[PDB]
Ligand binder design. Structure first.
Ligand SMILES: C[C@H](NC(=O)c1ccccc1C(F)(F)F)c1nnc(SCCOc2ccc(F)cc2)n1Cc1ccc(F)cc1
Ligand SMILES: C[C@H](NC(=O)c1ccccc1C(F)(F)F)c1nnc(SCCOc2ccc(F)cc2)n1Cc1ccc(F)cc1
Lengths: 306, 306
């Protein structure tokens, strides 16, 4: 006996969920438009039921806000609407956190209950390269201490406060650095998705996940993520690495075989250990774990018992 | 702005609040049953409203479980009813956690949504004195490592799993040790309250506060808790210390003056440092912070915005 309800591919797919849960052609066009060669069959058979389950929790939290406001005879110091409902998205580099997150942002905005949905990545809260250097942490980008934890906690707290205005900094992956002067403004959305390696990480004191209303961990066999990491790396030889401004131009194209080999070594030396030491242990902390098989198709969902 | 809604005493009192909330006389009689000279005016004027607020969260969770079971077309692997709703209660030694906990236990069982409310203290998860010897930890009794944290995690996990049967050990304060062979059995309650110094403490992997649905922190100025710790040590001269089976039986023989000196020492040397290091840093992780005046009456509630 476990604290999770477990579903295989078959039962999950088996949309007994008696909304004829099917997207329209307008929407499917829109969803192509996040093109990580996105498989619209998974969006409709898997991510749509998931947006639905999460929808039930957001709507529940919204009536609990109403009932509670009514009970407290709605006094001045109580807010006028619910604060943003915050979803955390965690997993290894290259498992597809960002794609999952973008898809949920899109699906969840479909309901009139919560149409304004924001997405922030914790990437924006890494220390600038210059600062990482000052601390001797360059070889540790994406490990817990390479993030300005205070700023990230201030950011999320302010969002949970129901501020009209919360600012995050912006990270360019192209430049391998924080963009000086850039800011993403978040203005009391109904939902805010927060995606990052570290979102479910444990801290001595108050931590970001203490402000999450729901959380998701994207999982896969460690070997399978290695393969996805390697492939994205070779593929980047065009798209990004090719660009002159790319911090990683000194790789831009140096033999497929030698790119495989370097990718494997960056994986084994940085990203894989960050996974074992720091990310995987946060897995049992998620409300929902999604396990994908070799070709990114979901084969197992574990959902915390309500 | 902050993540908290704040009430002072008068505001909380003002139960012109959308429902009449008064206790009946059979209720007030029952509530005297634990009447360590319980202030029954506070019980009806502060704790009743507090239990109502919590009830709203319990009932929300019950509906969400049903809306969710129906969306999932109710599978064999989803449980038939909600699993226990778990409330944590934390704060210093002598701050009145146990009283607080016992007053919400009886009050919450008032509603037919959730009549079966249990109470467990984490004291039952301290290592027995003998195992605490092997480890050189007798001087750290009540510090995070004096607990069998693995068994405490297993116990709370098993309850959140909806199992019919979960056993906690039993601590005797009289004998200053775990009673060998004795067990408290928990059998799928609607609500389980978990009271302890350590309930909201952080750790690297999964931690018990992950499995909570609501949590309370009982608060006061450190001066005042010292005053209550001291008063209770003196008072115990007559009561528990007087028992000849009392592990602290030699404390019965203490003059007032000697008792003040000794109590003041145990405090400023063991309990006060535990408060400052391990217990007080957990205060912002609570859903609700109850602050008490020197006289034991509540004077601030801080509640997390919904
Ligand atoms: C460790 C570093 N981490 C990140 O850049 C990073 C840091 C924080 C969040 C995400 C990421 C990212 F997804 F991009 F991997 C990394 N992990 N992979 C690389 S290569 C440049 C980015 O390339 C890829 C390749 C595949 C991929 F799936 C995502 C990004 N780096 C930069 C780097 C290369 C060599 C070296 F010796 C030190 C660093
Ligand atoms: C630090 C210790 N803590 C625990 O026993 C303990 C451990 C876990 C939870 C609760 C408690 C308790 F509240 F009872 F204090 C303690 N704190 N107070 C004492 S004296 C016996 C219990 O007396 C009181 C006195 C006041 C009070 F509010 C609660 C308990 N001890 C045992 C002890 C005495 C002398 C010495 F040198 C070392 C230890």
């Amino acid at each position: 006996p476990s604290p999770y309800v477990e579903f295989d591919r078959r039962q999950w797919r088996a949309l007994r969920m008696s909304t004829p849960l099917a997207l329209t052609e307008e929407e499917l066009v829109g969803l192509r438009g996040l093109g990580e060669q996105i498989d619209l069959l998974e969006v409709e058979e898997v991510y749509l039921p998931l947006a639905r389950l999460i929808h039930l929790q957001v709507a529940a939290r919204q009536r609990l806000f109403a009932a509670t406001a009514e009970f407290l005879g709605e006094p001045q110091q109580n807010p006028d609407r619910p604060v943003p409902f915050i979803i955390g998205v965690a997993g290894s580099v290259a498992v597809g956190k960002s794609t999952t997150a973008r898809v949920l942002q899109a699906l969840l905005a479909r309901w009139d209950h919560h149409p304004r949905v924001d997405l922030v990545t914790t990437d924006g809260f890494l220390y600038p390269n210059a600062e990482l250097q000052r601390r001797n942490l360059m070889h540790r980008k994406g490990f817990p201490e390479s993030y300005n934890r205070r700023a990230l906690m201030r950011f999320v707290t302010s969002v949970k406060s129901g501020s009209d205005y919360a600012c995050a900094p912006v990270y360019s992956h192209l430049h391998y650095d924080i963009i000086p002067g850039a800011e993403q403004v978040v203005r009391h959305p109904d939902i805010l998705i927060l995606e990052g390696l570290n979102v479910l990480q444990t801290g001595p004191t108050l931590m970001v996940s203490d402000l999450f209303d729901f959380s998701l961990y994207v999982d896969a066999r460690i070997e399978d993520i290695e393969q996805w990491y390697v492939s994205r790396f070779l593929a980047m030889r065009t798209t990004a690495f090719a660009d002159p401004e790319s911090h990683f131009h000194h790789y831009a194209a140096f033999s497929d075989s030698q790119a495989v080999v370097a990718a494997r070594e960056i994986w084994r030396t940085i990203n894989r250990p960050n996974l074992v030491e720091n990310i995987l242990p946060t897995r049992p902390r998620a409300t929902l774990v999604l396990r994908k098989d070799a070709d990114h198709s979901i084969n197992r969902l574990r959902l915390r018992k309500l």
